Design a protein around this ligand. Structure first.
Ligand SMILES: CCCCCCCCCCCCCCCCCC(=O)OC[C@H](COP(=O)([O-])OCC(O)COP(=O)([O-])OC[C@@H](COC(=O)CCCCCCCCCCCCCCCCC)OC(=O)CCCCCCCCCCCCCCCCC)OC(=O)CCCCCCCCCCCCCCCCC
Ligand SMILES: CCCCCCCCCCCCCCCCCC(=O)OC[C@H](COP(=O)([O-])OCC[N+](C)(C)C)OC(=O)CCCCCCCCCCCCCCCCC
Ligand SMILES: CCCCCCCCCCCCCCCCCC(=O)OC[C@H](COP(=O)([O-])OCC[N+](C)(C)C)OC(=O)CCCCCCCCCCCCCCCCC
Ligand SMILES: CCCCCCCCCCCCCCCCCC(=O)OC[C@H](COP(=O)([O-])OCC[N+](C)(C)C)OC(=O)CCCCCCCCCCCCCCCCC
Ligand SMILES: CCCCCCCCCCCCCCCCCC(=O)OC[C@H](COP(=O)([O-])OCC[N+](C)(C)C)OC(=O)CCCCCCCCCCCCCCCCC
Ligand SMILES: CCCCCCCCCCCCCCCCCC(=O)OC[C@H](COP(=O)([O-])OCC[N+](C)(C)C)OC(=O)CCCCCCCCCCCCCCCCC
Ligand code: SF4
Ligand code: SF4
Lengths: 165, 70, 102, 315, 105, 186, 67
């Protein structure tokens, strides 16, 4: 049910993202889309680690650059329209009552949670967020995360050169 | 003199002591068990599921009186 | 002092893990018996429901088998949507939404 | 699934929100009182009896004054910053270590870092929508210091998580059953005090929201209820930093009354450094956040990497 | 997580209701030309800064770097010890060498 | 004891003239004060010791702070012990008033006296300098002890002759005590 | 010299580098102590782990007393 609520909220924020043109308003629409995307990717998974990782990296880490650039880009304020708010509310109530009149068992995702797994599954009882993150720090896939940290340092070296400081 | 700060501080000590202690009363009222069941490990959630399967109150005990005589 | 405290915490969690390993096989056998019984009633419900759809037999997708290159009497566990089929949404969210609610 | 868990979680969260808000009001009273006693002068008095309903005198006044706006035409973006600020300050408290179960936050440090990473967002919409160059300068300065010590705070708490072996906040209790972490982490205690006075704008890190170099950084156009919500959100952040100091370093001790006495004492310490220290500069604060604290963070994280490897062989 | 959505929506609803009642309780006077003006001290009245932008970029690079330091507390009891130590020492040592090199240059 | 960068002369004192010490004991002392916040600990201790001090708040208006018998407050017009007004309309106070607040208009009275028909002091213009009581040959105009005379309205601070005479009638005891205890200094 | 200048200007970084060198030394000490014994065969397994006597892993189990 709440997965369908997040579907409806993402649809509504995407169509208002298509409608609006003010750059900080699109930045605000992105920062409120990232929360719903984080929660909706939290519904399929065993545990909410990667939603937290996407949260710190994308919203609190990266989009603040977008919010700063779009804040200094536009001198003017938002022109709030009650027509777009009314249309968003109408399509939101329509999509929630459409989720009310729809069977939620067929519309639920087939991806297993931590409790949707079998009871006799030995690997699920060990430690939360342990076996999924294991391949980051084991042979031979540790070279990718070493290359990722090197890639981030090289990215900073690129950014200092292209902005010319 | 300097003991007039303690009107403004000890009240801070009381109010923030409220949201646990009242629950330590309140879980003893409607549940009967003072602590709600910890949902950190998956085995605790499975055994809580087993209790709520066995009885409609998961904090109600199924002791040795449930076992039939044989 | 932190080493002594970590040793105490380690022996406490090893005690809890050993108690979990004691409790586990009885619950595994109980789940085994209920899983086999529920598979029998699910097969019976699918057999009685599909008595009018042409070209349908129980266990295969319209005649074509689901799993090949397997022994003829093997068993694979059905998926959570197919096992919790023939049931309301409240039984699906009864099990699937225990971690998500608390 | 048993419904009294939902009912008691709702009741406990609303009781936590109410008690946090009244403790915010009495924390403003405590700060005005003992901050006076930092100097020779007395604190609030003469209102009600012995100055006790002075924050209610603040609340009646701030909820009655004219809600002025930085421009006359469109000012709905002016509204959304104190709403989200008070929402985050009352929402961050859900990761408090409760021994009786309220929310089973197995990743509480990540939740705290998320709410701190929104602190930059509410102060950025505070700065931009107030239509003034002082407001934009204060918002940019606050975003600068808060993202400058966000990385440092993440590394310091990441070094602390190596001690308990997991991200569960209640695991701070079991590793503090014999001694507090103030003994083992005293330079980390001083660094964490410098961190917690930087994310929340206090006097040692006050170039963002001071009354000297700017008249006010991002509260310059906020008044008549918006300033009240912003003030309550900032003092709730002070209360959260006092609690989070008292969980990590001092023993969690959630039930004991000595834990809340120590929480009031760390709030007293926050008001004690409010009256003592002067204010850092932009260049010296970029020097502090990215070189000294970052180097100490990575170095003593290496120290706990070696120590947790050394104890893993011995245990 | 479903209880967290309910309590966060309740905090948002309570704060919006409190602010709406504060806007009703606020004393409504005649709106003015000068009262709506942005405040500059006294007499009535910024470009892009690259240094703050590279401060945000350094914050972003170190934030994505911290997001790879985050998992290894859990993995320490469930991985190869030599590989984990080599990756952790190499990770923080290359971070420290890069920080000191960017300090010196 | 650090050496002097600049040789200090006899009649002067030099600040920040000490050389920076280079022996290892002083370097370790400065290093520990930098790392462990020792000077900040001394500042915190000095700050915390003032909580235990006596507050100097004098609790207005039940307890009022010290004044002096020479204190300059509300201007007032005195009277003789027989009851005749002291002000002989001699106009040295208006001639000496630097803000020119005093306006005097004088006519001969019925018995032949010189006493005023108009004596106005603009207390919004008066700077409370006390030149009028020094320039008064009789002790007519005087600086009263009163300073709690804040007004709601701008016109109420325009003091007439009747307001000054009422101030002289009201405040006569303290003004006479101050003039008895202060006349030999002047 | 050079270490006196670093101890004069930047003493916290010198102390942190001493702590990091000590942590690297005791990390190598912990790795050598872990691999000196049979650290790959942990005493307390997770889950329910059983071996029959025909398995080669059943001959490598630890019969040490609980510490
Ligand atoms: C039974 C039926 C009875 C009749 C019902 C009739 C319904 C239709 C007619 C009303 C209507 O929609 O008018 C459109 C009319 C036109 O609005 P708009 O120009 O489309 O956009 C609003 C402006 O941008 C707003 O510009 P602004 O910045 O001047 O707005 C001032 C702001 C002032 O806001 C407040 O005072 C709210 C205080 C804070 C609330 C909590 C945070 C949000 O007012 C609002 O936000 C209104 C809500 O909107 C309203 O009248 C809004 C209230 C409804
Ligand atoms: C739900 C609220 C939707 C508000 C909205 O879309 O407002 C329209 C305005 C649109 O701003 P705009 O200036 O880009 O408007 C162009 C779009 N038309 C002309 C069709 C309205 O968006 C905002 O004000 C954003 C507010 C923050 C949203 C998060
Ligand atoms: C609905 C709630 C209505 C009552 C709200 C509380 C008002 C309390 C109040 O104003 O008390 C101060 C005022 C008096 O305080 P005051 O602030 O006017 O003066 C302090 C006194 N001096 C200046 C001499 C130091 O109380 C009253 O006027 C009578 C209060 C009766 C009890 C009211 C409820 C108290 C709880
Ligand atoms: C902890 C948070 C507490 C928040 C609330 C704190 C205060 C609570 C107690 C005091 C309530 C005061 C209510 C009125 C506030 C506005 C006063 C005002 O100017 O009203 C003028 C208005 C209109 O009067 P008017 O005709 O003079 O207004 C015309 C406009 N001017 C001012 C420019 C001339 O009065 C009312 O609308 C009367 C309201 C009566 C009911 C009051 C509320 C009762 C429930 C509480
Ligand atoms: C507006 C949003 C403000 C910022 C909220 C940040 C919350 C942390 C990010 C996140 O994904 O948290 C996962 C968390 C779930 O954390 P979790 O899954 O690790 O915790 C387990 C859940 N309990 C504690 C109940 C056992 O979800 C939320 O915080 C929901 C946020 C809802 C926001 C509603 C308004 C939009
Ligand atoms: C109950 C307690 C009562 C007393 C305390 C009450 C208050 C509670 C605590 C408050 C603390 C203060 C908070 C605000 C701080 C404001 C000042 C500030 O930020 O200063 C920054 C300053 C800035 O450094 P600085 O002083 O070098 O920089 C200024 C000088 N210039 C710019 C010229 C270079 O200090 C630091 O950042 C120091 C680093 C962190 C602390 C030291 C950690 C080092 C590693 C551990 C020890 C290593 C081993 C040593 C032994 C072996 C050696 C080989
Ligand atoms: S100097 Fe004295 S006596 Fe002369 S006119 Fe002035 S108040 Fe009257
Ligand atoms: S005190 Fe000075 S300013 Fe006032 S009336 Fe006397 S001479 Fe004029």
């Amino acid at each position: 049910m709440i997965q369908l609520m997040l579907y409806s909220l993402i649809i509504t924020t995407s169509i208002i993202f298509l409608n609006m043109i003010h750059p900080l308003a699109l930045g605000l629409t992105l920062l409120i889309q990232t929360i719903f995307v984080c929660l909706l990717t939290g519904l399929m998974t065993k545990s909410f680690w990667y939603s937290y990782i996407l949260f710190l990296i994308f919203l609190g880490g990266m989009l603040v650059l977008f919010i700063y650039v779009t804040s200094l880009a536009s001198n003017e304020m938002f022109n709030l329209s009650m027509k777009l708010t009314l249309f968003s509310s109408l399509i939101l109530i329509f999509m929630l009552i459409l989720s009310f009149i729809m069977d939620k068992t067929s519309s639920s995702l087939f991806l297993m949670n931590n409790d949707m797994q079998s009871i006799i599954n030995m690997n699920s009882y060990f430690m939360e967020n342990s076996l999924s993150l294991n391949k980051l720090y084991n042979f031979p896939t540790n070279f990718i995360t070493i290359l990722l940290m090197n890639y981030l340092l090289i990215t900073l070296i690129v950014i200092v050169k292209i902005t010319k400081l | 003199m300097w003991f007039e700060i303690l009107p403004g501080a000890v009240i801070i000590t009381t109010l923030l002591s409220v949201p646990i202690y009242a629950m330590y009363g309140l879980d003893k009222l409607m549940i009967g068990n003072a602590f709600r069941r910890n949902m950190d490990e998956r085995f605790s959630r499975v055994m809580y599921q087993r209790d709520f399967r066995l009885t409609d109150n998961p904090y109600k005990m199924n002791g040795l009186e449930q076992i039939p005589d044989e | 002092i932190y080493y002594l405290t970590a040793k105490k915490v380690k022996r406490d969690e090893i005690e809890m893990r050993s108690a979990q390993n004691v409790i586990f096989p009885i619950l595994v056998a109980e789940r085994d018996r209920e899983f086999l019984r529920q598979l029998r009633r699910n097969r019976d419900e699918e057999a009685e429901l599909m008595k009018n759809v042409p070209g349908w037999e129980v266990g295969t997708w319209y005649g074509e088998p689901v799993f090949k290159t397997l022994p003829e009497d093997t068993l694979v566990t059905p998926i959570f949507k197919e096992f919790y089929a023939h049931s309301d949404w409240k039984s699906y969210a009864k099990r699937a939404h225990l971690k998500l609610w608390s | 699934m048993f419904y009294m868990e939902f009912i008691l979680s709702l009741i406990g969260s609303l009781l936590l929100i109410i008690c946090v808000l009244v403790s915010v009001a009495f924390l403003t009273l405590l700060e005005r009182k003992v901050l006076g006693y930092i100097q020779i002068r007395k604190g609030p008095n003469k209102v009600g009896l012995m100055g006790i309903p002075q924050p209610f005198c603040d609340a009646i006044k701030l909820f009655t004054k004219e809600q002025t706006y930085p421009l006359l035409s469109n000012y709905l973006s002016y509204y959304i910053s104190p709403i989200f600020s008070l929402f985050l300050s009352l929402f961050v408290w859900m990761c408090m270590p409760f021994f009786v179960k309220l929310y089973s936050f197995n990743l509480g440090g990540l939740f705290f870092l998320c709410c701190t990473s929104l602190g930059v967002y509410t102060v950025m919409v505070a700065g931009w929508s107030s239509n003034s160059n002082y407001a934009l300068l204060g918002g940019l300065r606050a975003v600068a210091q808060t993202i400058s010590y966000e990385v440092s705070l993440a590394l310091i708490l990441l070094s602390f998580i190596f001690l308990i072996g997991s991200y569960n906040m209640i695991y701070f209790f079991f590793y503090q059953v014999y001694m507090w972490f103030l003994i083992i982490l005293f330079p980390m205690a001083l660094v964490w005090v410098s961190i917690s006075l930087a994310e929340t704008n206090r006097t040692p890190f006050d170039f963002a929201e001071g009354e000297s170099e700017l008249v006010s950084g991002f509260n310059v156009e906020y008044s008549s209820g918006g300033f009240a919500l912003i003030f309550m959100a900032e003092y709730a952040s002070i209360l959260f930093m006092s609690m989070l100091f008292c969980v990590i370093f001092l023993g969690c001790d959630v039930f004991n009354l000595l834990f809340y006495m120590k929480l009031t004492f760390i709030s007293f310490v926050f008001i004690w450094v409010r009256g003592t220290l002067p204010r850092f500069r932009y260049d010296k604060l970029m020097y502090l956040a990215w070189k000294c604290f970052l180097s100490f963070s990575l170095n003593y994280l290496l120290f706990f990497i070696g120590f947790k490897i050394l104890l893993f062989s011995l245990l | 997580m479903f209880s967290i959505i309910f309590i966060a929506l309740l905090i948002l609803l309570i704060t919006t209701i409190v602010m709406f009642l504060a806007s009703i309780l606020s004393k409504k006077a005649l709106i003015d030309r000068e009262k709506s003006s942005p405040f500059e001290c006294g007499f009535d009245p910024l470009p892009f800064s690259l240094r703050f932008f590279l401060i945000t970029i350094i914050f972003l690079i170190f934030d994505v770097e911290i997001a790879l330091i985050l998992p290894m507390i859990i993995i320490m009891k469930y991985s190869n010890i030599m590989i984990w130590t080599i990756t952790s020492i190499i990770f923080i040592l290359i971070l420290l060498i890069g920080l000191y090199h960017e300090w010196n240059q | 004891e650090p050496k002097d960068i600049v040789e200090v002369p006899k009649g002067y004192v030099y600040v920040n003239n000490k050389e920076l010490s280079m022996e290892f004991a002083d370097i370790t002392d400065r290093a520990a004060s930098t790392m462990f916040f020792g000077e900040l600990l001394r500042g915190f201790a000095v700050t915390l010791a003032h909580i235990f001090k006596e507050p100097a708040t004098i609790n207005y208006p039940f307890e009022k702070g010290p004044l002096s018998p020479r204190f300059r407050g509300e201007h007032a017009l005195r009277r003789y012990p027989s009851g005749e007004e002291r002000c002989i309309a001699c106009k040295l106070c208006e001639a000496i008033c630097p803000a020119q607040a005093i306006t005097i208009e004088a006519e001969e009275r019925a018995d032949g006296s010189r006493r005023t028909t108009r004596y106005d002091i603009d207390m919004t213009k008066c700077i409370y300098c006390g030149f009028c009581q020094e320039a008064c040959p009789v002790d007519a105009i005087v600086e009263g002890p009163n300073f709690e005379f804040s007004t709601e309205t701008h016109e109420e601070l325009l003091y007439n002759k009747e307001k000054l005479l009422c101030n002289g009638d009201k405040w006569e005891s303290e003004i006479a005590s101050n003039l008895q205890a202060d006349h030999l200094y002047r | 010299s050079l270490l006196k200048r670093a101890w004069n200007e930047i003493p916290d970084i010198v102390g942190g580098s001493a702590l990091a060198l000590a942590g690297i030394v005791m990390a190598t000490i912990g790795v050598a102590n872990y691999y000196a014994k049979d650290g790959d065969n942990r005493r307390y397994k997770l889950g329910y782990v059983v071996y029959r006597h025909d398995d080669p892993r059943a001959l490598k189990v630890r019969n040490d007393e609980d510490d």
